[PDB]
TrEMBL record, chain A:
GO terms for biological process: transcription by RNA polymerase I; transcription by RNA polymerase II; tRNA transcription by RNA polymerase III. GO terms for molecular function: DNA binding; DNA-directed RNA polymerase activity. The chain holds residues 48 to 147 of 147 of the full protein. Keywords: DNA-directed RNA polymerase, Transcription. Signal peptide: none annotated. Component of the DNA-directed RNA polymerase (RNAP) that catalyzes the transcription in the cytoplasm of viral DNA into RNA using the four ribonucleoside triphosphates as substrates. Belongs to the archaeal RpoK/eukaryotic RPB6 RNA polymerase subunit family. The gene is C147L CDS. One of its GO terms (cellular component) is DNA-directed RNA polymerase complex. This is C147L. Part of the viral DNA-directed RNA polymerase that consists of 8 polII-like subunits (RPB1, RPB2, RPB3, RPB5, RPB6, RPB7, RPB9, RPB10), a capping enzyme and a termination factor.
Automatic annotation (TrEMBL), chain D:
GO terms for molecular function: DNA binding; DNA-directed RNA polymerase activity. Residues 128-200 form the RNA polymerase subunit H/Rpb5 C-terminal domain. This is DNA-directed RNA polymerase RPB5 homolog. It comes from the Viruses. Component of the DNA-directed RNA polymerase (RNAP) that catalyzes the transcription in the cytoplasm of viral DNA into RNA using the four ribonucleoside triphosphates as substrates. Pfam families: RNA_pol_Rpb5_C. Part of the viral DNA-directed RNA polymerase that consists of 8 polII-like subunits (RPB1, RPB2, RPB3, RPB5, RPB6, RPB7, RPB9, RPB10), a capping enzyme and a termination factor. Keywords: Transcription. Belongs to the archaeal RpoH/eukaryotic RPB5 RNA polymerase subunit family. GO terms for biological process: transcription by RNA polymerase II; transcription elongation by RNA polymerase I; tRNA transcription by RNA polymerase III. InterPro entries: Arch_Rpo5/euc_Rpb5, RNA_pol_subH/Rpb5_C, RPB5-like_sf.
Automatic annotation (TrEMBL), chain E:
This is DNA-directed RNA polymerase subunit. It comes from African swine fever virus. Catalytic component of the DNA-directed RNA polymerase (RNAP) that catalyzes the transcription in the cytoplasm of viral DNA into RNA using the four ribonucleoside triphosphates as substrates. Forms the polymerase active center together with RPB2. Part of the core element with the central large cleft, the clamp element that moves to open and close the cleft and the jaws that are thought to grab the incoming DNA template. Belongs to the RNA polymerase beta' chain family. Part of the viral DNA-directed RNA polymerase that consists of 8 polII-like subunits (RPB1, RPB2, RPB3, RPB5, RPB6, RPB7, RPB9, RPB10), a capping enzyme and a termination factor.
Length: 100, 48, 145, 205, 97
């Protein structure tokens, strides 16, 4: 039979209708820093001003200084008509948890 | 205290003052209760 | 039956403390209250007695509570009975809430055995294969598609 | 002493469900006399939407619970009576719930009468005022529009909610049917109280 | 180990979603995690002062009489209602245990 599931269309909730929190979870901040540190290990191209000798410190400082070039997508629902309703959050405009 | 349950949603809906689900009002009941005791007028006279 | 209610072997007399609001609005813990802690459960039998308060029958049996009171009372009964086993170093209340809410989410009290898993997540073949017996679970999955 | 408790709390059950009694209430002695001789007692009540609800209390030694023919005859003649029936409550002793033949007559009368709700309940379900039991949280039926608004805000389907049987004693005293939603306000030792919404499913018997 | 492995396989699918609910892939197990939405590592034991007080000690300690405005009649009235509701709920919990 039709094993292949049909393609989905990405439905982005307008920014004034988002229901999830404006504060990053510790999981999300850790994921952002890990992903960005791996990207820097790939390229090394950053807009951070101060010099750091490791990708991890550059990633944390980019998150803390609100310069991280990543977006958080929170998948809210998969409609059985084909839509994938998600929320897009900008970590540069979000609260940052206690990463100590 | 009236805007306390918006901790469970976000600051966008708090600014827009959208309706709050009933189960989220109930989840802020102990913190609403505690704040009204510890921030009572008789206890906050020396606070600007 | 010559005397007593069926299902209960021994009935003791215990002293317990309860709170109450006075006419002056004060909450006072009353220590001079005598209960009957029985040996064996029959909620319906104790309910039919005119010497017992029927609205405050506290059975330790989840199945007895589920049958007579419902799933929401049985949820509170699972919480209470796990608390008793845990003791004084018992976990936070929200971990007891997690057991009871899972065990009662279908409207009936399911177990943490392979029968309860099949009742809550029947289509999760891989989870059910990992628990107890893959060959049996795999055989039904292939047959049932 | 199930008969004595039933004689009071069945009428408490009728009042809690917001119905008007149709016959004059007889005293308890002739209630037991009619249960022992006629084999059952019949209580009729009228709902706000003019539906008629009849409750049959069957004695534990009566013929209707031991012989399926008598039960089939009684149900056939009562359901053929020209009344605006909407709900029949057949209160039987607990062991009767394990008799396959009686339940077979029950489900066959259901099949022959698709628009009439037929329910058979044990004794203990009407031997208390179930809502006033301390261990039972506060149950309340909610409308389909409110439930739809709640589910729409939550991006949920009715099949994702926690579910509750229609034979649950609080739901029975509410009169909840499968497909309905019951909001339960329940005590919490973490938040001092909580609210859940459950989806009412089919009765087990 | 026997009880640990059976408890984990029955509960491991319970995961917090974006509404702070606990569900099994779509199906609600809790409308809100722990009914308060909190982490167990972020809790402090705190005493609520009004619970044990009488009607007169409550009005002596918490009713403000410096300003003769109807606001403070309402502020104290909300203190009694919270006090009464707390007593009602947890006295009932004392009943079924």
């Amino acid at each position: 039979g039709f094993v292949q599931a049909s393609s989905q269309t990405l439905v982005i909730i307008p920014d004034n209708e988002r229901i999830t929190s404006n504060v990053l979870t510790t999981f999300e901040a850790t994921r952002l820093v890990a992903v960005r540190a791996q990207q820097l290990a790939i390229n090394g191209s950053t807009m951070l001003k101060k010099k750091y000798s490791s990708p991890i410190d550059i990633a944390k400082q980019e998150l803390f200084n609100r310069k991280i070039p990543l977006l958080v997508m929170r998948c809210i629902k998969v409609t059985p008509e084909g839509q994938k309703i998600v929320e897009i959050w900008n970590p540069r405009e979000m609260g940052i948890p206690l990463l100590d | 205290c009236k805007n306390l349950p918006y901790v469970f949603i976000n600051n966008i809906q708090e600014r827009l003052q959208t309706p709050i689900p009933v189960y989220l009002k109930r989840a802020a009941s102990l913190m609403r209760m505690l704040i009204r005791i510890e921030l009572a007028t008789v206890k906050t006279l020396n606070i600007t | 039956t010559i005397r007593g209610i069926p299902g209960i072997k021994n009935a003791n007399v215990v002293k317990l403390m309860r709170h109450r609001v006075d006419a002056q609005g004060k909450l006072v813990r009353l220590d001079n209250i005598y209960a009957i802690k029985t040996n064996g459960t029959n909620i319906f039998g104790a309910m039919l007695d005119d010497n017992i308060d029927p609205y405050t029958i506290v059975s330790s049996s989840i199945g007895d509570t589920m049958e007579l009171y419902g799933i929401e009372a049985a949820r509170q009964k699972i919480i209470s009975e796990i608390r008793t086993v845990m003791g004084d170093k018992g976990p936070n209340h929200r971990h007891l809430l997690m057991y009871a809410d899972l065990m009662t989410r279908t409207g009936q009290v399911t177990s943490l055995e392979k029968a309860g898993l099949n009742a809550r997540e029947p289509s999760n073949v891989l989870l059910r294969m990992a628990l107890s017996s893959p060959v049996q679970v795999l055989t039904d999955a292939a047959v049932d598609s | 002493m199930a008969m004595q408790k039933l004689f009071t709390y069945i009428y408490e059950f009728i009042e809690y469900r917001k119905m008007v009694l149709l016959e004059e209430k007889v005293p308890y002695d002739k209630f037991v006399q009619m249960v022992l001789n006629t084999g059952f007692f019949r209580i009729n009540a009228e709902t706000l939407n003019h539906g008629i609800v009849s409750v049959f209390i069957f004695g534990a030694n009566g013929k209707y619970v031991h012989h399926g023919g008598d039960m089939r005859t009684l149900l056939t003649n009562t359901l053929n009576e020209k009344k605006h029936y909407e709900e029949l409550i057949l209160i039987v002793d607990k062991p009767v719930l394990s008799k396959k033949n009686i339940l077979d007559i029950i489900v066959e009368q259901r099949a022959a009468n698709p628009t009439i709700v037929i329910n058979i309940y044990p004794y203990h379900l009407f031997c208390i005022n179930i809502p006033k039991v301390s261990a039972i949280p506060k149950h309340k039926l909610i409308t389909q529009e409110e439930a739809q608004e709640f589910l729409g805000r939550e991006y949920l389907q009715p099949q994702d909610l926690m579910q509750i049987s229609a034979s649950d004693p609080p739901v029975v005293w509410l009169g909840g049917r499968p497909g309905d939603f019951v909001q339960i306000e329940r005590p919490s030792e973490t938040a001092m109280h909580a609210v859940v919404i459950r989806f009412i499913t089919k009765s087990k018997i | 180990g026997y009880a640990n492995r059976k408890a984990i396989f029955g509960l491991q699918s319970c995961i917090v979603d974006y509404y702070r609910r606990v569900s099994i892939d779509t199906r609600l197990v809790q409308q809100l995690y722990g009914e308060d939405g909190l982490d167990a590592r972020q809790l402090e034991t705190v005493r609520f002062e009004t619970i044990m007080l009488s009607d007169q000690e409550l009005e002596d300690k918490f009713k403000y009489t410096g300003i003769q405005s109807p606001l403070f009649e309402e502020e104290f009235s909300r203190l009694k209602k919270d006090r009464d509701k707390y007593r009602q709920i947890f006295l009932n919990v004392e009943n079924f245990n």
